Amino acid sequence: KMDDWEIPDGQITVGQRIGSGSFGTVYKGKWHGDVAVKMLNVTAPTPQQLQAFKNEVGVLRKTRHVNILLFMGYSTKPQLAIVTQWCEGSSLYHHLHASETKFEMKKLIDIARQTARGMDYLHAKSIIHRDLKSNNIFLHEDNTVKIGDFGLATESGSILWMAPEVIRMQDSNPYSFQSDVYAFGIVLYELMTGQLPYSNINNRDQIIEMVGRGSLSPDLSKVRSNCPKRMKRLMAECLKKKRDERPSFPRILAEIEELARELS
Amino acid sequence: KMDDWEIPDGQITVGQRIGSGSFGTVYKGKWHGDVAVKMLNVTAPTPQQLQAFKNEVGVLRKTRHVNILLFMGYSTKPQLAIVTQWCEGSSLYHHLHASETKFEMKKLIDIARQTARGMDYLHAKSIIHRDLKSNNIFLHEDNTVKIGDFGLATESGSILWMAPEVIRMQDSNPYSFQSDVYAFGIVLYELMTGQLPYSNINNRDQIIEMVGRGSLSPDLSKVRSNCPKRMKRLMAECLKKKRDERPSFPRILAEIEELARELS
Ligand SMILES: Cc1ccc(C(=O)Nc2ccc(CN3CCN(C)CC3)c(C(F)(F)F)c2)cc1C#Cc1cnc2cccnn12
Ligand SMILES: Cc1ccc(C(=O)Nc2ccc(CN3CCN(C)CC3)c(C(F)(F)F)c2)cc1C#Cc1cnc2cccnn12
Ligand SMILES: [N+]
Ligand SMILES: [N+]
């Protein structure tokens, strides 16, 4: 039952504020070591806010994997809050797009590989991320990928990871395993090029229209010269405009693991 | 309910055998990346073996902390098995007592600190380890302590970590939070001296008798010259012959965290 992960009031020490976001405000904290606490920052949660809290706790409780941010518990007083492990360092987004760090290809592949492990796990439990993007991939201790859904803005933007069908939305719910695969394709692009797609287009509404219609797609000729050819091909497959031509994660993971195994 | 963490048959790939032990046989495996699988290696589990399996799953399910080995799931077919994350490297025992590695003091303190985090967490949930010893402290990636209860023999032996009251056993069940604190004291000794206590005594039965009676205790004059004085004092307190003079983990952890914070 849910109360097994309830942390009684008074035990958590809230420290430095990290950021407010779409899912609450995040702090560093102490509770049997370092933790992160995401607070619903709100005077009277409505029943919808309560349901959403419950939903996040419910899904996080189903995850036990080294590449999924570790859920540790929740509290309902002093306020609504979710507690996770504390990750040191910063996001993949931060490393690629807003830092002097340039990773070696082995490391780039290892990041890809870990990210694929996490996603394969989530898909195996029928969990659809919907917000996979480099800013939701934390490089804990610069080494271990932790996927989360942090809701913190970068230093929609996020429309860069959306599959064509997600942008078009001609049915109610266009999200799927295959849409997460597309987003993962865009993370691969980021890794293998160092860049965000469509850097030479300055109108987010044209990017939206054009990706939706199939007239614009990421320029794969930009991948670095030492990107393995099978990586570039997998990326192309993850980015297929037609949802059902994209591969599934078990195959994605196996093929990346094969690339990583060869580079010693 | 328990079945939420059941992994269906066929999904796990069992690889290299690691060791048989007191709690089953351990293999490296693949399941959405690397895992360890501990197999009950047995043709017809008795009801006691089944209960013990359930007990291990039940306790491991209550743990979500970065310094407790991550439980991931179990199977009941092909055989009884528990699945955890795969730890790279080796045990603390291995590093201190059977390797060329000599750690710096900062690192030794950080190991102490992480181990204290894990133990404080387990005690906060009323979990008594009973087998805390350096061979049950894994240094994952040489950096992150993962406490488990692996049951694998080293390259009782384990009587070295037993508090006097545990050896004497004048009541049925001499185990407690305070007995885990003593064992942690002996891990501190290992860290700060590089050695097992009582290396100049070759009769395990005399060590047993004498620790039980209070006539023999670890020689703390052996700690390395750069061991902080407050560390040496905490170790002395964790090793108190009288159970109730030993500190609790919240205090143990706070004082180690204070030592670690000062060394930058
Ligand atoms: C305190 C906290 C609480 C919660 C979460 C959080 O990630 N929530 C989460 C919600 C849902 C899902 C899965 N769903 C996605 C939606 N989808 C519709 C359904 C499936 C997942 C996922 F991991 F499974 F992806 C995570 C993160 C933080 C953090 C933190 C933290 C830790 N270190 C640092 C360092 C700097 C900054 N922050 N930080
Ligand atoms: C597959 C597997 C399954 C289970 C366990 C296991 O640790 N079980 C466990 C049972 C009980 C308890 C707590 N109780 C102690 C008793 N006490 C009476 C009650 C409280 C805990 C603890 F972590 F909480 F301590 C752990 C470990 C392995 C492993 C592995 C593995 C992973 N990487 C490697 C690399 C090399 C070798 N092995 N390996
Ligand atoms: N990082
Ligand atoms: N290690």
- Separation CA B182–CA B146 (nearest Å): 19
Give the bridge partners for B19, in sequence order: B26
Q: With beta carbons less than 8 A apart as the criterion, state whether B145 and B121 touch.
A: no
In the 8-state DSSP scheme, what is residue A24? E
Q: In the PDB record, what is the listed experimental method?
A: X-ray
DSSP string, B28-82: EEESSSEEEEEE---SS--HHHHHHHHHHHHHHHT---TTB--EEEEE-SSS-EE
Q: CA–CA separation, B83 vs B26, rounded Å?
A: 10
Q: Residue B146 belongs to what H/E stretch?
A: strand B144-147
**CA angle at residue B131 from B220 to B28, to 5 degrees?**
120
- Strands B89-91, B81-85: pairing kind: unpaired
Helices (H), chain B: 47-61, 92-97, 105-124, 164-168, 177-193, 204-213, 229-238, 249-262
What b/e sequence results for B228-253 when a residue is b if at least 16 CB atoms lie within 10 Å of its CB, and e otherwise? Answer: beebbebbbebbbeebeebbebeebb
Helices (H), A62-203: 92-97, 105-124, 164-168, 177-193
Q: How far apart, in Å, are the Cα atoms of B181 and each of A32, B108, B258? A: 16, 18, 18
- C-alpha B186/C-alpha B139 separation (Å) is 17
Q: Which of B32, B72, B74 best tests the A interface by mutation, with the highest count of A CBs <10 A?
A: B32
Picking from A64, A124, A253, the nearest residue to B70 by CB comes out as A64
- Mind telling me the catalytic residues of A? 131
| Residue A40 beta carbon below 6 angstroms from any ligand 1 atom | no
End-to-end CA distance of chain A: 45
Distance, CA of A32 to CA of B68 (rounded, Å): 12
Angstrom resolution of this structure: 2.1
Structure token digits, residue B153 = 């023999």
Residue whose C-alpha is closest to residue B213's, from B167, B154, B171, B151: B167
The two structure tokens encoding residue A117: 């492990």
With CB atoms and an 8 Å threshold, state whether B33 touches A72. Answer: no
Q: Which two tokens stand for residue B40?
A: 């009950």
Handedness of CA B34, B59, B125, A54 (dihedral sign): positive
Peptide linkage before A228 cis (omega within 30 of 0): no
Q: For residues A43 and A41, give the distance between their C-alpha atoms in angstroms, rounded to a whole number.
A: 7
Q: How close is the nearest chain A Cα to the Cα of B238, in Å?
A: 18
Query: Which chain B residues touch A72 with a CB distance below 8 Å?
Result: 64-65
Which value, to the nearest 10 degrees, does the dihedral of the CA atoms of residues B148, B150, B156, B161 take? Answer: -10
CA atoms within 13 A on the CB side of B242: 2
Tokens for A244, please give them: 């059902």
- Are B235 and B223 a contacting pair, CB within 8 Å? yes
Instruction: Tell me the C-alpha distance between A140 and A90, whole Å.
Output: 7
Contact B33 A66 (CB under 8 A): yes
Using an 8 Å Cβ cutoff, are B17 and B8 in contact? no
Question: Which residue, among A1, A26, A28, A2, has the nearest Cα to A13 in the 3D structure?
Answer: A28
* Centroid of chain to Cα B14: 25
- The b-or-e profile of B6-37 (16+ CB within 10 A means b, else e) is ebeeeebeeeeeeeeeebbbbbebbbbbbbbb
In this complex, do B33 and A121 lie within 8 Å of one another by their Cβ atoms? Answer: yes
- Which contacts (CB < 8 Å, 24+ apart) does range A38-41 have? A38/A81, A38/A82, A38/A84, A39/A14, A39/A79, A39/A80, A39/A81, A40/A79, A40/A80, A40/A81, A41/A79
3-class secondary structure, A140: strand
In this structure, the number of other CB atoms found within 10 A of the CB of residue B3 comes to: 7
Listed in sequence order, the residues at least 6 apart from A10 whose beta carbon sits closer than 8 Å to its beta carbon are none
Across chain A, where does the E strand assignment appear? 13-21, 24-30, 34-39, 71-75, 81-85, 89-91, 137-140, 144-147
Count other C-beta atoms under 10 Å from residue B101's C-beta: 12
Cα angle value A61/A110/A129 (rounded, 5°):
35
Q: How far apart are CA A222 and CA A192, in angstroms?
A: 8
B168 three-state secondary structure: helix
Residues pairing with A36 in the sheet: A28, A84
Using CB atoms within 10 Å of the CB of residue B80, give its burial: 0 to 12 exposed, 13 to 18 middle, 19+ buried: buried
| Radius of gyration of chain B, Cα coordinates, nearest whole angstrom | 19
The sign of the torsion formed by the CA atoms of B80, B132, B118, B112 equals negative
C-alpha distances in Å from residue A213, one per residue of A80, A163, A197, A207, A209: 42, 11, 16, 10, 6
Instruction: Collect all residues from A whose CB is shorter than 8 A from any CB in B.
Output: 4-5, 11, 32-33, 62, 64-67, 70-73, 85, 114, 117, 120-121, 124, 141, 143, 253
CB atoms near residue A20 (< 10 Å):
14
How far is B23 from B134, CA to CA, in rounded Å?
18
Cα radius of gyration (chain A): 19
Rounded Cα distance between A15 and A38, Å, is 12
Q: Which two tokens mark A133?
A: 């993007």
> Do the strands A81-85 and A137-140 form a parallel or antiparallel pair, or are they unpaired?
unpaired
List the A13-21 sheet strands across, edge first.
A13-21, A24-30, A34-39, A81-85, A71-75
CB-hemisphere CA count at 13 Å for A166?
17
Query: Can you read off the two tokens belonging to residue B167?
Result: 């050896």
DSSP A92: H
Q: Residue type at A6? A: E
Q: Is B142's C-beta closer than 6 angstroms to any atom of ligand 4?
A: yes
**Residue-wise burial string across A247-261, b where 16 or more C-beta atoms lie within 10 A, e elsewhere:** bebeebbebbbebbe
| Residue at B23: amino acid letter | F
- Is B17 strand, coil or helix? strand
Residue closest by Cα to atom 27 of ligand 1: A150
CA dihedral of residues B128, B134, B140, B142 (deg, nearest 10) = 150
- The neighbouring-strand residues paired with B144 are B140
Shortest CA distance from A249: residue in chain B: B32
The end-to-end CA distance of chain B, in Å, is: 45
Cis bond leading into A78, ω under 30°? yes
Annotated binding residue at A19? yes
- In one letter, which amino acid is B207? I
